[PDB]
Amino acid sequence: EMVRKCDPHIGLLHRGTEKLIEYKTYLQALPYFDRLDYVSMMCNEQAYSIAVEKLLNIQPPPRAQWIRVLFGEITRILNHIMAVTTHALDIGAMTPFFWMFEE
Amino acid sequence: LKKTTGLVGLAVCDTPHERLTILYTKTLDILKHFPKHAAYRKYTEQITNEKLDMVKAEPDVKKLEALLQGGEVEEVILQAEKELSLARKMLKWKPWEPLVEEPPANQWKWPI
Amino acid sequence: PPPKLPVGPSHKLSNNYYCTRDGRREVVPPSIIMSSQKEKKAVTPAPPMKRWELSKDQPYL
Amino acid sequence: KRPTVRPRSDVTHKQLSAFGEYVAEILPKYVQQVQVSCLDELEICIHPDGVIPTLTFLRDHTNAQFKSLADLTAVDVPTRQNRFEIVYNLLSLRFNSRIRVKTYADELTPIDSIVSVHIAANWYEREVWDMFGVFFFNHPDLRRILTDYGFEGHPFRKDFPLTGYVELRYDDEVKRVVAEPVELAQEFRKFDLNSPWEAFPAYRQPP
Amino acid sequence: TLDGIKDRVLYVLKLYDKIDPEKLSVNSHFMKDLGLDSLDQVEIIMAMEDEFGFEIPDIDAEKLMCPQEIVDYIAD
Amino acid sequence: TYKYVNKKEQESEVDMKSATDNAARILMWTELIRGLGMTLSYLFREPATINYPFEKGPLSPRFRGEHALRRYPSGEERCIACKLCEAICPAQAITIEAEPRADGSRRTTRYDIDMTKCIYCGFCQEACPVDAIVEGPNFEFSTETHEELLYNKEKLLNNGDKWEAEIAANIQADYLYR
Amino acid sequence: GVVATVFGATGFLGRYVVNHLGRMGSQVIIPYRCDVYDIMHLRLMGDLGQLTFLEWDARDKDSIRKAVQHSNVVINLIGREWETRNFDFEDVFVNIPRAIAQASKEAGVERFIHVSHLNASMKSSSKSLRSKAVGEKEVRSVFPEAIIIRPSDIFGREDRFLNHFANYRWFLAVPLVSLGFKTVKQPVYVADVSKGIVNATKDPDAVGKTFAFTGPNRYLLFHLVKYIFGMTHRTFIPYPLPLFVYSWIGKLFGLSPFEPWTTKDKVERIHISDVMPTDLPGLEDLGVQPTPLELKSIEVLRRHRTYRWLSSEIEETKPAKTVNY
Amino acid sequence: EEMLTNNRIWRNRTVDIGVVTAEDALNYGFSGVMLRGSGIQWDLRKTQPYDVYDQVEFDVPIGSRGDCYDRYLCRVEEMRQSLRIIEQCLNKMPPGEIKVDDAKVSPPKRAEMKTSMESLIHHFKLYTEGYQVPPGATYTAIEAPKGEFGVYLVSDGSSRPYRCKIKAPGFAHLAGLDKMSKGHMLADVVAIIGTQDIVFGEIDR
Amino acid sequence: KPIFSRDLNEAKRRVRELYRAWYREVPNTVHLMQLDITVKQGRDKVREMFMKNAHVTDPRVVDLLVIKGKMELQETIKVWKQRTHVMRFFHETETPRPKDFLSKFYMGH
Amino acid sequence: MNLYTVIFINILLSLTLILVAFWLPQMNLYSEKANPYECGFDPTSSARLPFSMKFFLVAITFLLFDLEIALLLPLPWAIQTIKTSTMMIMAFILVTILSLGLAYEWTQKGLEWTE
Ligand SMILES: NC(=O)C1=CN([C@@H]2O[C@H](COP(=O)(O)OP(=O)(O)OC[C@H]3O[C@@H](n4cnc5c(N)ncnc54)[C@H](OP(=O)(O)O)[C@@H]3O)[C@@H](O)[C@H]2O)C=CC1
Ligand code: SF4
Ligand code: SF4
């Protein structure tokens, strides 16, 4: 049961998002970033928005930036819940999962 | 004596000043073999001389770290070793020579 | 209750020409520092990063 | 100042220009161009022979500890002679800065694998090979990574069709999942959304 | 036993099916005479390795164009 | 600013009381009993599960559900074959063919949405200039066949007529935010 | 532009017929009586709207008319290897085919394709074959241009032939009439038969003819069973057993309320020797190159082996001996 | 935390599993908690702030042994720090608009679209052809919950992006799984997978 | 410029070594993956795939072909490539279209 | 007899459950279903290959400890003796010998699994 070698095989969920995005407009390509990391959707799309804003040379308004930070933090809490309570589930601790998925 | 560096896998050295002097002196000695006009030689000599002077001036380890602006003295020692190895590699690479080959006509033209 | 949301800075009825507040048209191509088509002191990409401070809220957990 | 325009600072731009000249004069044998964008992003375009020397220097040198390989990418520009542009995005934590290193390659002109410098490249180079066909010398285990096991082609190339040439379905006669040429109930619609009017006079290529 | 070597070689060359048994001869160039191809001659060499339990490098193997050359090589 | 989540505290705090407390912790399973007590505490709480079929969760006026095509109060259909919906649909689920109606009006002869291809994003209803195409609050429209999930103009109009009151209420509540 | 109604789709050959029709891209109508769960395997054989499943009953002729309403081709694969409590051989091979043919004629279907059997004769010792001959006559009476297909034994993954024989291992030894000899079998491949039927759905010359789909080789039953047991590396212990005892054993096995393992008619048909082509067209007329049993026996017989012999090559088994009668 | 932090079984099952040194983490390209649990002081929210993160106070947790247990503590502490940031956001939410008042980039309000010719034209074009992005190339990185999420976006001056490479933090982490699994059992590998925090949507793209 | 082989002769040496490797591996592949084909069929397929690229004359292109063939060989040696992936080399689901002008005229354009 | 009867009844109940389980459900057999399981991909090697044991030493130690239990089990009858001094001396010596063996293995690192 000792692991002498690991060979991760990925690509079983490669749908070609990067090539698809080339055929869309920037707004049409925004939703792809919600689906990239399906546990930190708003963080992903915030990263995309910051990139597009950098290339456009525009600045989002202060209230928009504060909303974005608030929901980035909510999303981080969501993702850390998922990470911690699925690590616990894989180890063998089941009840944290049920306690935290209510939140 | 520091009980720990903050970084996993990086042990605390008991002879930081001696080790730093050793490594900086080795870097200067190896740089002596570079061509005189090598910009790498010139700049690396500048940096190593400045850091070696700081080490010579400062006996206390904490204030030495503050002067060096390189985190922990162990990290500075690691960077010194890296610089020495890089100097050894550069002495064979010889990057000071003229551009090996120019690009095609518009290899870096964007938007195309 | 019903909302009444505000307006942005550029809802002025005067002094609001778009050429002044245009952002995309102020983007300029990158500056070519050196090109193959055409003592100094050592420098870094930026001043060395400052060391962080142990928190006052709760340094140790 | 102007609420809807990004605020720009010149300190970062000047520092990046200085460091760009620094690297250019430290490696004259490989550096072919250097530029700092209006976004403040130093970009060093090198000859493909200088990839390993350049990255080793940019990682080991004290005044440039770009120790994190954030990205290794390829961009496909079919027109130019060298189709593929390999882009390395690097991060220096000591100086809290980012640099970009660019080179070029063709379908028949490999590049030197930098797995010795950065081990992070071990999979990025595999992805580049799989999706563009750029080969890398001295790679410990270069092979496909993202595409199907027997997949033929390099999808991310611009000449590759969006939906490829093959698709899978289950065939009861042979009791297997079989690969067949692609037929779609509704073909992809390529909307022509390009206006005749130029939007940006600052990027007007001379006639 | 060069005669035994030559007999095993002919046995394998006849067990190979692309060639023509009657036209197959100890003096018949695989490429020029029998009509075999590069890959065919590669399979012939692999069959000889099977029979003799002996390996053959490609550099040495590229020249074994005829059964007499094969048996002379096996003489080793 | 940083904090140490797990930093060594001491390696010489020796008194009999501390040693005996650690021994009692090891031999009596104190933290294990603490965890058992936490689970026992949870057992005696009101479960958060809801009787789903007869008790549904909350939903906002902005909930993006099954699509529908609306009509004017006079019974006229709002759709005027803009094809902004079709042009903006990121997944290309919308397919529209229109003709000049007998009235001389601009109206659609076919308007199909592939609900197995739609990503339920709302770009269509936010790009529609006349509030013709909407996403009602319906989230329970699963089928036993694939073809039933290819909506046509009649299906979408029937959905609009069915959910008109709720769709109108949601638009009334949310339009000022739009 | 073909619209084809397959009346025995939910079977061993019907699935292949439906699969090939779907590949050709013709609309398919599947009239079924089984449970909806039994048609899931056909569910995925066609793109959207290509396949139309509708419930039907042999007794109710309205269902037959509804099935054959808008069809240009009607393929009739109805059949059964045992006499059900409600349906017997006469009903299955005469009444239902005749009713389907008459409904199709009244509706106006261009093509009608009926599947019988190679040894279907009016004088056959087998009740099923004797009924099949009468069914051929009635179908050609009520639909004079109906095509007739007469396959030999069909072997495939879901067959009752190679599987049937390989299942004799559960009974230690293999009882054979005359020890297999004096019995010639010419098995055809199910994919070949399905391709033949689908091609006959459009071949201009096929209308009004009778085809005989038979494999390439003819084996003696003994050598065929020996080959089957060689493929399923089992111990072949053949021994002779007179036909009356064999028929009694079949009678015993045919008393189960469910699907009998064997039956009197099943043993009769197993032991009646196949005929010779004798001027009938055959698969090559419709353009199907018959596939030998040697190539496709492994995919049918590999699941009857034990772990020791599971991963054995097709070439590890000696091919049977083919007669030339 | 009462359930997992001090439990001897959890401690035995996570402590000293998949230990990674700081230098190896940097050279393998780990980001976020993977770096911070090994002692490296890095966090884009602090070092390369974006949006209004420079206006909020929080602490970056740091590990000492670089093991699964240290990373778990780092994540549990990051949740509390996120609560700390959320409070400040709720208290400092300014009043104003929500999208850049530039109808050539962000769509106009529907009420204006249904009244003003310029707003209607801009809405039409924004939802049909979209806004054009001036030519160039950028790399933007953020401290996403899983690490450093990055996008290298190349615009050719049109309204459709020319190239968009996505740097998923898990792509570099999953590559180091072989390194971290050395000298460990299958159960330990299972434990290691969770700490890397991998969703394969970003890994595969 | 040389990827590996200086000239077509060295490239051919590499190609022949690859053919040896595939020819050797076919029996083990069939036995292990329980394919419903014969070793003769597998080796015929290997020859067909090799000959499908016999027109190439550039040493660099030959080197690329040999590298990708070696990759496929590794993928098959290891059981990363499954039976469904290997039986795709045989195209036993394709009904060939004719090359006759009149047949093409009848079916489609 | 009262024990043979109950054991046979339990065996027959289990066998009847097996018979019902196998002869009641409708069965559809094919190679794809009957193939071995491995997370959706075909096994790359037989399961009969050698499977290294990292606790072989602890197993062969468990054998000896099981025989030690064999020696210790007659104690309930042993304590019923008039030579209680001898019985106590023997029990203590045996238990201490077992403890010394365990301690020696522990120190020499026999209880640690092989890597
Ligand atoms: N060895 C062979 O397989 C040979 C087959 N044939 C002929 O080919 C035809 C196909 O038989 P095959 O499919 O191979 O074996 P099946 O027994 O699977 O064919 C049975 C088909 O007939 C349907 N069916 C049976 N009884 C009735 C009924 N009373 N009312 C309605 N439908 C009914 C079944 O539907 P369900 O099962 O859902 O009730 C099924 O679709 C038969 O005529 C057979 O004699 C010819 C030569 C040899
Ligand atoms: S859905 Fe809306 S935008 Fe599209 S055609 Fe109808 S009214 Fe116009
Ligand atoms: S919700 Fe989005 S994906 Fe769905 S039809 Fe509307 S625009 Fe298309």
Q: How many CB atoms lie within 10 A of CB H71?
A: 31
Q: Which of H47, G43, J79 is nearest to D98 (CA)?
A: H47
Give the count of alpha carbons within 13 A of G192, CB side only.
27
Helices and strands, counts by H and E, chain C: 1, 1
Nearest-ligand number for the alpha carbon of F153 = 2
Residue B78 near residue B20 (C-beta atoms within 8 A):
no
Cα J39 from Cα H100, distance rounded (Å): 50
Cα dihedral angle (G288, G289, G295, G298), rounded to 10 degrees? 10
Q: Which of H18, H19, H44 is nearest to H31 (CA)?
A: H44
Task: Render G58-125 in DSSP notation, one character per residue.
Answer: SS-HHHHHHHTTT-SEEEE----SS--SS--HHIIIIIHHHHHHHHHHHHT-SEEEEE--TT--TT-S
Query: Does I94 sit within 8 Å of D180, measured CB to CB?
Result: yes
In Å, what is the CA distance from H99 to each residue of A49, A65, F60, F69, I109? 12, 9, 22, 28, 54
C21 → closest Cβ in D4, D13, D20: D4
User: Strand, coil or helix: what is D44?
Assistant: strand
Quick check: CB of F149 below 6 Å from ligand 3? no
In Å, what is the CA distance from G122 to each residue of G128, G132, G135, G188, G233? 10, 8, 10, 23, 39
User: Strand, coil or helix: what is F149?
Assistant: helix
**Residue F130 CA: which ligand 2 atom is closest?**
7
- Across-strand partners of G188? G154
Distance of CA G190 to the CA centre of its chain: 8
User: Across chain F, where does the E strand assignment appear?
Assistant: 2-4, 67-69, 94-100, 106-114, 133-135, 150-151
Residue G113 near residue G75 (C-beta atoms within 8 A):
yes
Cα F141 from Cα F120, distance rounded (Å): 13
Cα A71 from Cα H52, distance rounded (Å): 12
User: Strand, coil or helix: what is H21?
Assistant: coil
In Å, what is the CA distance from F116 to each residue of A31, A37, F156, G48? 17, 22, 15, 12
F124 is in an annotated binding site: yes
Nearest-ligand number for the alpha carbon of F128 = 2
Q: How many CB atoms lie within 10 A of CB G280?
A: 17
Distance of CA G155 to the CA centre of its chain: 8
User: Strand, coil or helix: what is I64?
Assistant: helix
Residue I39 near residue G313 (C-beta atoms within 8 A):
yes
- Across-strand partners of H154? H137, H163
45-84 in J: which are within 8 Å (CB) of I? Answer: 45
- The alpha helices in A6-61, defined as continuous H runs, are 17-21, 26-36, 41-56
Query: Does G299 sit within 8 Å of I39, measured CB to CB?
Result: no
Nearest-ligand number for the alpha carbon of G56 = 1
User: Strand, coil or helix: what is B78?
Assistant: helix
Backbone angles phi, psi at H97, to 5 degrees: -90, 180
Residue G112 near residue G201 (C-beta atoms within 8 A):
no
Residues in chain D: 207
* CA dihedral sign of residues F40, F41, F46, F47: negative
Residue E74 near residue E5 (C-beta atoms within 8 A):
yes
| 3-state SS string for G204-269 | HHHCCCEECCCCCCEEEHHHHHHHHHHHCCCCCCEEECCHHHHHHHHHHHCCCCCCCCCCHHHHHH
**Residue F120 CA: which ligand 3 atom is closest?**
1
Query: Does A95 sit within 8 Å of F90, measured CB to CB?
Result: no
Least CA distance to G195: which residue of chain I? I95
User: Strand, coil or helix: what is E35?
Assistant: coil
Nearest-ligand number for the alpha carbon of F135 = 3
Query: Does H29 sit within 8 Å of D73, measured CB to CB?
Result: no
Quick check: CB of F61 below 6 Å from ligand 3? no
Q: In this structure, which residue's CA is closest to atom 6 in ligand 2?
A: F79
Task: Render chain J in DSSP notation, one character per residue.
Answer: -HHHHHHHHHHHHHHHHHHHHHHSS-----HHHHSPPSTTS--SS-TTS----TTHHHHHHHHHHHHHHHHHTTHHHHTTSS-HHHHHHHHHHHHHHHHHHHHHHHHHT-SSPP-
Q: Which of G167, G85, G258 is nearest to J24 (CA)?
A: G258
Q: In this structure, which residue's CA is closest to atom 8 in ligand 2?
A: F82
User: Across chain H, where does the E strand assignment appear?
Assistant: 60-62, 136-144, 147-155, 163-167
Whole-angstrom Cα Rg for chain A: 18
Chain G contact for J22, CB < 8 A? no
> Please, which contacts does E38-44 make with residues 24 or more away whose CB atoms are closer than 8 Å?
E38/I12, E38/I16, E39/I16, E39/I19, E39/I47, E39/I50, E39/I51, E41/E65, E42/I16, E42/I19, E42/I20, E42/I23, E43/E16, E43/I23, E44/E12, E44/E13, E44/E16
Residues in chain A: 103
Cα G309 from Cα G305, distance rounded (Å): 6
- Using a CB-CB distance cutoff of 8 angstroms, which residues of chain D are in contact with residue F92? 188-189
Structure determined via:
cryo-EM
Q: Which of I100, J98, H204 is nearest to A38 (CA)?
A: H204
Ligand 3 binding pocket mutation candidate from F111, F124, F126, F159 (most atoms within 8 A of CB): F124
Residue F117 near residue F53 (C-beta atoms within 8 A):
no
Tokens of G44: 């995925």
Q: Which residues line ligand 1 (CB under 6 A)?
A: G 8, 10-14, 33-34, 38, 58, 77-81, 87, 92, 115, 117, 151, 153-154, 161
Tokens of A25: 């407009």
Least CA distance to C32: which residue of chain B? B108
Cα J10 from Cα J17, distance rounded (Å): 11
In Å, what is the CA distance from J100 to each residue of G165, J88, J95? 67, 18, 9
Q: DSSP assignment, residue D109?
A: B
Backbone angles phi, psi at E44, to 5 degrees: -60, -45
Residues whose CB falls within 8 Å of the CB of residue G240, separated by 6 or more in sequence, listed in order: G175, G176, G177, G178, G179
F133 is in an annotated binding site: no
- Resolution of the deposited coordinates, in angstroms? 3.2
Tokens of I25: 């591996």
Cα D7 from Cα D3, distance rounded (Å): 9
Determine how β-strand G27-32 pairs with β-strand G3-6.
parallel
Cα F103 from Cα F82, distance rounded (Å): 17
Cα G99 from Cα G112, distance rounded (Å): 12
User: Strand, coil or helix: what is F63?
Assistant: coil
F87 → closest Cβ in D186, D188, D191: D191
- Across-strand partners of G114? G76, G148
Tokens of J12: 């027959």
Least CA distance to H204: which residue of chain A? A14
13-52 in E: which are within 8 Å (CB) of I? Answer: 38-39, 42-43, 46
Tokens of G297: 């026996």
> Please, which contacts does J31-35 make with residues 24 or more away whose CB atoms are closer than 8 Å?
J31/D175, J31/G302, J31/G303, J32/D175, J34/G303
In Å, what is the CA distance from F137 to each residue of F49, F151, F160, F166? 22, 17, 11, 8
Residue G240 near residue G178 (C-beta atoms within 8 A):
yes
Distance of CA D103 to the CA centre of its chain: 9
Residue H22 near residue H38 (C-beta atoms within 8 A):
yes
Residue I80 near residue I29 (C-beta atoms within 8 A):
no
- Using a CB-CB distance cutoff of 8 angstroms, which residues of chain E are in contact with residue I13? 58, 62
In Å, what is the CA distance from I74 to each residue of D145, I21, I25, I77? 14, 10, 10, 5
Residue D88 near residue D105 (C-beta atoms within 8 A):
no
A90 → closest Cβ in H90, H166, H194: H194
Q: Which of F171, F172, F160, F175 is nearest to F75 (CA)?
A: F160
* F170, amino acid identity: N
F115 is in an annotated binding site: no
Distance of CA G203 to the CA centre of its chain: 21
Ligand 2 binding pocket mutation candidate from F72, F89, F128 (most atoms within 8 A of CB): F128
Cα F119 from Cα C25, distance rounded (Å): 34
User: Strand, coil or helix: what is H140?
Assistant: strand
H68 is in an annotated binding site: yes
- Across-strand partners of H149? H142
Strand order in the sheet with C31-35: C31-35, D31-36, D42-46, D97-105, D84-92, D68-76
- Using a CB-CB distance cutoff of 8 angstroms, which residues of chain J are in contact with residue A12? none
Q: Return the partners of chain E (3 or more C-beta pairs < 8 Å).
A: I
Residue D46 near residue A98 (C-beta atoms within 8 A):
no
Q: Which of G132, G164, G123 is nearest to G150 (CA)?
A: G132
Tokens of F85: 């919906």
Residue G18 near residue G28 (C-beta atoms within 8 A):
yes
- Given the residues E7, E17, E33, E37, select the one marked as catalytic: E37
* CA dihedral sign of residues J106, J109, J110, J112: positive
Q: How far is the CA of F137 from the centre of ligand 3 (A)?
A: 15
**Within chain E, what is the greatest distance between any pair of CA atoms?**
30
Q: Which of G46, G197, G33 is nearest to G111 (CA)?
A: G197
Cα A56 from Cα H155, distance rounded (Å): 10
D-F contacts at Cβ under 8 angstroms:
5
Asked about E37 being catalytic, the answer comes back as yes
User: Strand, coil or helix: what is D168?
Assistant: strand
Residue indicated by tokens 């241009």:
G145
- Using a CB-CB distance cutoff of 8 angstroms, which residues of chain G are in contact with residue J30? 157, 303
Cα E51 from Cα E11, distance rounded (Å): 9
Tokens of D198: 């130029």
Residues whose CB falls within 8 Å of the CB of residue G38, separated by 6 or more in sequence, listed in order: G10, G32
CATH 3.65.10.10 describes domain J2-115 = no
F42 is in an annotated binding site: no
Give residues after which chain F gaps, C-N over 2.5 angstroms: none
Residue G186 near residue G217 (C-beta atoms within 8 A):
yes
Residue I76 near residue I86 (C-beta atoms within 8 A):
yes
Residue C5 near residue F176 (C-beta atoms within 8 A):
yes
Helix, strand and coil percent figures for chain H, each rounded to 5: 45, 15, 40
- The alpha carbon of residue H142 is apart from the nearest alpha carbon of chain B, in Å, by 23
B-C contacts at Cβ under 8 angstroms:
12
* F177, amino acid identity: Y
User: Across chain B, where does the E strand assignment appear?
Assistant: none
Tokens of I24: 């050797």
Cα A40 from Cα D118, distance rounded (Å): 28
Q: DSSP assignment, residue F137?
A: S
* CA dihedral sign of residues A75, A80, A86, A89: negative
Q: How many CB atoms lie within 10 A of CB H88?
A: 18
Determine how β-strand G238-240 pairs with β-strand G174-176.
parallel
Cα F122 from Cα F67, distance rounded (Å): 9
User: Strand, coil or helix: what is D45?
Assistant: strand
Q: Return the partners of chain A (3 or more C-beta pairs < 8 Å).
A: C, D, F, H, J
Cα D79 from Cα D91, distance rounded (Å): 31
- Across-strand partners of G219? G185, G322
Residue indicated by tokens 């091919």:
G319
